[PDB]
Ligand binder design. Structure first.
Ligand SMILES: Cc1cc(-c2noc(C(F)(F)F)n2)ccc1OCCCc1cc(C(=O)N(C)C)no1
Lengths: 238, 39, 99, 296, 49, 238, 238, 39
């Protein structure tokens, strides 16, 4: 009853038979911007199924020495499908996200992945006074990897990352994690090309292990924007 | 004692005892019941 | 209040308060653009809105630009005036500005 | 029409418009009226409940701020061998609001102003180092500020018998005290001060232009009450004025060129733009040049 | 295009105006950078004479 | 009352002070596809202001020997703004159009332009048995010119073209023409890259003339799609 | 309905067929001094039609290099008709004004005049510390010309002069401007020979231009005092 | 807090929210209507 789940958005659907539950960040659900909170006065465009659908990013391989992976939103989706086109043609965007992380192995495999959505994951640089550059932060669809997951690449602690909305993929228990993210920002809308509201981090707290014949064990991320709206139409910028 | 005209000049407000820890301790769509297995 | 659109070295006095337009032999040609920054020294600075606003630090709300054509009664023409929300470079072609 | 406005206006959502005979975006500037085109008529809008306050732009708030109007330094010492032009332990000031540009420009945004004036006097002292470049400490002196109205006699020396102030309002304050403060009422002989006066002050032709005699205030006379010490000090008096209970009429184009004099609106302008006589706004290469174009 | 007959001026002028709508608001009063002085204005000293 | 008109769609607006009226093709107004006429069962995307707005094409010069101009819809708009992106990312589209043609001159100028919207303007080739090729038909934003406007480039008559929705731009009378086009098709929706429902033709029945000093006299076309909807989302094809 | 206007005061009348509207300064109309605002206790004289009538000043020529013109009130009228006599024989006066500025040209002419009534237009001198003298300010019926209209001859801006009651004479639009001025003073009455309440400024923001055969293009000012009253009768002074 | 006997001694008055911008934006005898041509 809580291990099987189907998510359907637009023309996309996902089914998992080894879920635990799914997390609604801070007990909230995505919604459109209400009139009593709006700032931009132009009529927003709400593409609905054109943008509110699952986009699957490139899979990554879970290796023995893997330190972890991250993707910044909306940066990771800014060049994908109609969501990317709307982002490129509009000065302002707003949306939640539905995140589904997939990783399966055998009953002889072991490992634990922490799947956490970090709001405003401002990254720090290691052993230097220079702030991270644009190329260090904006990785797009490919995402990045943690240099020091122990401190979340920001001088904090991985052990306390559970304060953020998160699930675990414990191979003996489940093969997928689902997190629903509301709009998380100090402003009602934002410029999607210069600010990232959420960071999805997947960190192998317990390394992948087995004594059976080894196989590639990928981790796959599917993200569906929810309640997308865009304001300030102009020419494409990207 | 606040004789200033601007409300933000007032002293601190230490009377908001409202709590909702479930936002961080139980942010799951399906609420869990006591004793019953979670999975 | 009038904008100083023609803030160029060739314009003196009230010449800076009008923009001259002539007949062109190519289509869809750009005529002028207006920087929209009130804090910087631009065409909007020495206006009622600009002067009053520069006594403050934050601002919000809509602005309106009104243009009066001061040609002869016999003159005719059509122009397109475009506002481009920020994010990119100022459009240099009509097909981009009209978006 | 007069109305009570506390927040910026809300926006109402709007739909496509194609109506013969209706052109809200067209206007006639020649009538002298500002365009009445609404955002809902120019573009398709959403509904927005605007909660932005407008109180900080109230004229009272805009003008009711303490601003420097007078700053005078004089030597506190034995003035037996001082020149006739030297301030010998006291000074007099013909009150005006035209000496410091920050307040003057804001006041000159209006033609007529009616207000009461809160006056704050701030005093600082420093030991004279000329020859006697030795520090002994700062004395806590007593000062007297006397308001001398039109037609009253002003003191001519620090120990003048005019300081007895039989009817003149005087305030005695110490340097160690917080700055002295008093309120001066709206004292114009008219219903409002004339910020600008296009006229002459006398019935002959040699009177001063641009100063309304109805707004004449008088003289502020400030002395050190203490007799001089064996060593000399430099005393600096700063006078701040804050208008309150303000009424304003007929706003005016702001001053652009630098002020030249406190007696007139004479103008010269900067050597080159910005704020030059022939170019108020700084130049750009051409009307198609975006000065701060964003590239990538 | 701008199209005029031979007897009209071949160059015509526009005057651009700007104003805020009644949804405009301002906050955080500050000293305007549009005016300043580096010395006392002429005749300011005479007030003390 | 009938000479001044303002059209406002999305973030675009047009004002003319020398209109005659405006034509609603066959006395109809654009609308969305009703449930009792729909065929495709997927939820359509309706971008609204993002696509339902005025797009201005490149102006053309009215010369003495000009034979006329045409633009095919939606071909002319298939690579412009969010309308182009939605067309490229969807198999099916549907929309009306609002057409505004602009041409001004002096009171010493004369000339008459027929502005007609031809439904299913299947073109023929002159003096050959070979049917027109793809490059002859699909001209995109630049449009084409009439080889033989006298017969509408299809063996018919220009004199009878008034049976189609049309206006005139008679220089002494008006400087603009406006035509509102409903969805005109045998099917509820269509593939926008292979079929053109409407053809806009501007033909100088009376040549431009004057004895005053000559100036360039352009003709400008602005077209706003109305009630756009798209079905069958997939990757961009263009 | 708003382009034709007739003004009738006393024995004078003016008709214009190319007006835009007319401006009532600060939305006010002239009136006599009420009892609850009076100061002088002597019975005032109210000549009515003898003084409340249109006086036409000398016309000025609009040239290519014209910088603009101004007239100070009541100085300009202080020696004209019964208004001048009453001013000369009385210590105190009070009145509004009705200003009508006239300038006509051909449909081949272009130009724009700003017609603004400046309250308390205290003039400054250029490049000197000396205040303007009596002869610089009091020009009478002939008026003066702007030395630097760009800054309104007072160190302010011409661009912001629209904050004052004003109209425009745009040659392609209208040939006259009308402004109604109420009593504008800090005091209920004033000495007419030493203070000017209003300054009428006509500034050619857009220079006169044409390619047709040139003709003299005058600008004519007609001013009618309204609700005149005078107090403090004595011998003539002028 | 004003214990002074003269009313002009009081603190500032920042509660006058009355506005009439039409005095400067529309000082015309004939009011203009929305959409309808001005001329
Ligand atoms: C600065 C000052 C100081 C004192 C004073 N100092 O000490 C004392 C004493 F003796 F009681 F202790 N009185 C008195 C009055 C003062 O100024 C009055 C400001 C009024 C005004 C008119 C205009 C104007 O002309 N406008 C706006 C066009 N502006 O402001």
């Amino acid at each position: 009853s809580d291990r099987v789940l189907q998510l359907k958005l637009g023309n996309s659907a996902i089914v998992t038979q080894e879920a635990a539950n799914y997390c609604c960040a801070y007990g909230e659900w995505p919604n459109y911007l209400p009139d009593h909170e709006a700032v931009a006065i132009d009529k927003p465009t709400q593409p609905e199924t054109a943008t509110d659908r699952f986009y699957t990013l490139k899979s990554v391989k879970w290796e023995t020495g893997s330190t972890g992976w991250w993707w910044k939103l909306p940066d990771a989706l800014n060049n994908i499908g109609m969501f990317g086109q709307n982002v490129q043609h509009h000065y302002l965007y707003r949306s939640g996200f539905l995140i589904h992380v997939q990783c399966n192995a055998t009953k002889f495999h072991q490992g634990a992945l922490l799947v956490v959505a970090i709001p405003e994951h401002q990254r720090g640089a290691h052993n230097t006074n220079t702030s991270p550059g644009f190329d260090d932060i904006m990785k797009g669809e490919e995402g990045g990897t943690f240099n020091h997951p122990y401190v979340l690449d920001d001088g904090t602690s991985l052990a306390c990352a559970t304060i953020f909305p998160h699930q675990w993929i414990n191979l003996r228990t489940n093969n997928s994690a689902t997190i629903v993210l509301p709009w998380m920002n100090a402003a009602p809308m934002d410029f999607p090309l210069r600010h990232n509201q959420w960071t999805l981090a997947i960190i192998p707290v317990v390394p992948l292990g087995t004594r059976t014949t080894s196989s590639m064990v990928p981790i796959t991320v599917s993200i569906a924007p929810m309640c997308c709206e865009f304001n300030g139409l102009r020419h494409a910028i990207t | 004692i606040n004789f200033y005209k601007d409300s933000y000049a007032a002293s601190a407000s230490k009377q908001d005892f409202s709590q909702d820890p479930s936002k961080f301790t139980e942010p799951v769509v399906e609420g869990l019941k006591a004793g019953a297995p979670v999975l | 209040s009038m904008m100083e659109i023609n803030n160029t070295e060739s314009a003196v006095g009230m010449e800076r308060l009008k923009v001259d337009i002539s007949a062109l032999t190519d289509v869809d040609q750009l005529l002028f653009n207006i920087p929209l920054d009130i804090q910087l020294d631009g065409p909007l600075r020495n206006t009622l809105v600009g002067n009053i606003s520069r006594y403050y630090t934050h601002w919000s709300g809509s602005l309106e630009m009104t243009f009066m054509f001061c040609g002869s009664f016999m003159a005719a023409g059509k122009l397109i005036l475009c506002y481009t929300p920020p994010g990119g470079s100022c459009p240099t072609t009509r097909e981009t500005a009209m978006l | 029409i007069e109305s009570i406005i506390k927040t910026a206006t809300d926006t109402v959502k709007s739909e496509i418009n194609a109506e013969l005979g209706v052109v809200p975006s067209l206007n006639a500037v020649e009538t002298g009226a500002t365009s009445n085109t609404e955002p809902e008529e120019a573009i398709q809008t959403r509904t927005v409940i605007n909660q932005h306050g407008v109180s900080e732009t109230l004229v009272e708030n805009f003008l009711s701020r303490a601003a420097l109007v007078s700053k005078r330094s004089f030597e506190y010492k034995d003035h037996t061998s001082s020149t006739a032009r030297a301030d010998k332990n006291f000074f007099k000031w013909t009150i005006n609001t035209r000496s410091f540009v920050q307040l003057r420009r804001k006041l000159e945004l209006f033609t007529y102003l009616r207000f009461d004036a809160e006056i704050t006097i701030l005093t600082t002292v420093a030991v004279n180092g000329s020859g006697n470049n030795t520090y002994v400490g700062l004395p806590d002196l007593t000062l007297q500020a006397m308001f001398v109205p039109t037609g009253a006699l002003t003191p001519e020396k620090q120990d003048s018998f005019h300081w007895q102030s039989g009817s003149n309002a005087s305030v005695f304050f110490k340097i160690s005290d917080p700055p002295a403060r008093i309120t001066i009422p709206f004292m114009c002989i008219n219903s409002a001060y004339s910020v600008f006066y296009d006229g002459f002050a006398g019935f002959e032709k040699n009177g001063l232009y641009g100063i309304n005699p109805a707004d004449t205030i008088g003289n502020l006379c400030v002395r050190i009450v203490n007799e001089h010490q064996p060593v000399g000090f430099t005393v600096t008096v700063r006078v701040y004025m804050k208008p309150k209970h303000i009424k304003a009429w007929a706003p005016r184009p702001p001053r652009t060129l630098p002020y030249m004099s406190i007696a007139n609106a004479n103008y010269k302008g900067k050597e080159r733009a910005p704020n030059a006589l022939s170019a108020i706004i700084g130049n750009r290469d051409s009307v198609k040049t975006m000065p701060h174009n964003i590239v990538n | 295009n701008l199209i005029v007959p031979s007897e009209s001026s071949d160059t015509c002028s526009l005057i651009g105006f700007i104003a805020a709508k009644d949804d405009f608001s301002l906050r955080l009063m500050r000293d305007s950078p549009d005016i300043g002085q580096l010395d006392h204005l002429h005749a300011a000293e005479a007030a003390y004479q």
